[PDB]
Symmetry: D2
Subunit: 125 residues, 4 copies
């Protein structure tokens, strides 16, 4: 009974996609988004709420949470749902220092379609 | 008396700095960071824990939280403080649909130096 | 100012701070929005979070104690207000304090902006 | 494997413990804590950062996040680690409405001992 669903991100729009933008000299930038190939809805009633990034350096006994991004605006206003003109898209950039290569894991949440995860390898050298 | 401290970011390394990077297809990309000009420490004992971004479109009576970024790694491990080699930089990028100009406000928190605020204008026309 | 501190005629948004206990520095604080008169909780209108800050009397800086997010507002694949799961905007923060001082709570309504409440923590 | 470690909370104090305080007239209150019977340390260098509660109603294909509590103070101050006098206990109370019984899952995080989970049944009637 696994809560964190996984799939091919080219076929399933809910999967968080991890992209290593740079990993030069211990300086790391990692972009994570939901709906890269197929866009996910972002309305007052249906949206991605957050992405969390976890990094486990090779040989490390435990993983470390790198950070978490909340996407809080989804068009709600006093004029009703989907009227504010403000919608936060589910994409986040995490910049961090690291001394070793390791494993990246991302988790994301859709308010109606449950929890999701994805993985990538971080190579420094 | 205010909880939220403000200052010249050229002199003070705590003020969150707001940078509007791009605006295409109805989406705006806003980078927020602490320590852009003068790096704030990131140790187990002393670090920026999060940044939160708020946007109030012109003509809107209320502001909207766009999002929040937590910076969760600060070097802690079973081997002691500042030993994990993983340190999350206090920088975030928020992408959000916006249709109007208005005011951006960013809040940030240092675990020992209290709460901070920065402001900028989003100009769409 | 972004942080509103006074309620309207019919709608209460100001976070209410209650010190449940405080013996020997072992402290429990309940923060709520709309405990007497409920604030709406729908997909379209809800309190999203409460954050509690504490500044001990001698401290130059305040500390965040904690933050509670209220994440369920009834949305499901069957549509809004069909999940039957709705998180009330109430939190209990338990913490150690060695000194008296000032409590500040912040909260956010997704359509009614940002709010601030204040109370004193007295240990003796 | 899985990033979320589990165990008998009586033997492993990292495991989040779910206590259903009430579950009567649609009205549910649930206490979740780490270190219920055996306290987990709370120091600047080593502490529980957050707990997240998840609920999946019987017959619901997807789980829902009920809420998330962050425990942000760990004694840090301008005078050094473990000097502030302010430490947030990793205990949270989630009050929520439910229409059906189901499965509660809690997630928690220790800054040095990785990610943890616990489970409990919610019976309404
Ligand atoms: Fe979805
Ligand atoms: Fe600082
Ligand atoms: Fe409201
Ligand atoms: Fe631990």
């Amino acid at each position: 009974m696994e809560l964190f669903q996984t799939a091919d991100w080219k076929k399933q729009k809910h999967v968080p996609v991890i992209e290593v933008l740079r990993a030069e000299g211990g300086v790391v930038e990692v972009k994570v988004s939901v709906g890269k190939e197929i866009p996910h809805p972002n309305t007052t009633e249906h949206h991605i709420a957050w992405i969390e990034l976890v990094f486990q350096p090779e040989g490390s006994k435990f993983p470390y949470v790198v950070g978490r991004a909340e996407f809080a605006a989804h068009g709600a206003s006093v004029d009703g749902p989907n009227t504010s003109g403000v919608y936060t898209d589910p994409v986040a950039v995490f910049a961090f220092k690291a001394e070793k290569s390791g494993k990246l894991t991302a988790f994301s949440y859709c308010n109606i379609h449950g929890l999701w995860m994805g993985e990538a390898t971080l190579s420094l050298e």
